[PDB]
Amino acid sequence: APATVCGPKLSTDLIKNQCVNFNFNGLTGTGVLTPSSKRFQPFQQFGRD
Amino acid sequence: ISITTEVMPVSMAKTSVDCNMYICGDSTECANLLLQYGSFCTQLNRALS
């Protein structure tokens, strides 16, 4: 959902640059983080392959 | 004189796979955990190479 109960970690800002240890609400990993054009209804906040 | 097609497959998709990206690409603790198996990084990748 819109992520409600968070942790004390400070929030940085995104970069389009490759290979960033992204942590969008407990979703760790890495990768190129380029913005794209996807629809994303407001009741869906996490798209999959 | 009847000419006749005869279709013969000669090759398939030259599919490789990164074994370490398939098993666990982002985690390095899992890559540490996968390391104590055999040479499945090598031999599994060398077999379909």
Side-chain angles (χ1 to χ4, degrees), chain B residues 4-49:
Chain B
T4 301
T5 63
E6 186 177 6
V7 57
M8 295 298 292
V10 295
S11 68
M12 64 180 179
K14 292 172 66 176
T15 299
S16 176
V17 55
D18 189 83
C19 181
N20 207 164
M21 192 69 201
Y22 183 82
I23 297 300
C24 46
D26 295 331
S27 175
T28 183
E29 192 273 334
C30 173
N32 205 166
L33 189 62
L34 182 279
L35 193 278
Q36 67 180 356
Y37 289 93
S39 65
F40 295 97
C41 297
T42 300
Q43 190 275 131
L44 196 284
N45 196 3
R46 186 180 62 193
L48 85 173
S49 176

Side-chain angles (χ1 to χ4, degrees), chain A residues 19-49:
Chain A
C19 292
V20 184
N21 294 116
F22 66 97
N23 203 162
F24 294 96
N25 299 321
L27 298 170
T28 60
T30 182
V32 181
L33 200 65
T34 301
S36 67
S37 178
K38 292 183 178 180
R39 292 182 68 90
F40 278 103
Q41 296 182 358
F43 294 95
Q44 55 185 358
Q45 296 296 106
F46 175 70
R48 290 184 177 177
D49 278 329

Side-chain angles (χ1 to χ4, degrees), chain A residues 7-29:
Chain A
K9 302 297 292 296
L10 61 51
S11 66
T12 61
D13 192 77
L14 66 94
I15 51 175
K16 188 263 182 183
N17 212 172
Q18 62 178 354
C19 292
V20 184
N21 294 116
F22 66 97
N23 203 162
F24 294 96
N25 299 321
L27 298 170
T28 60

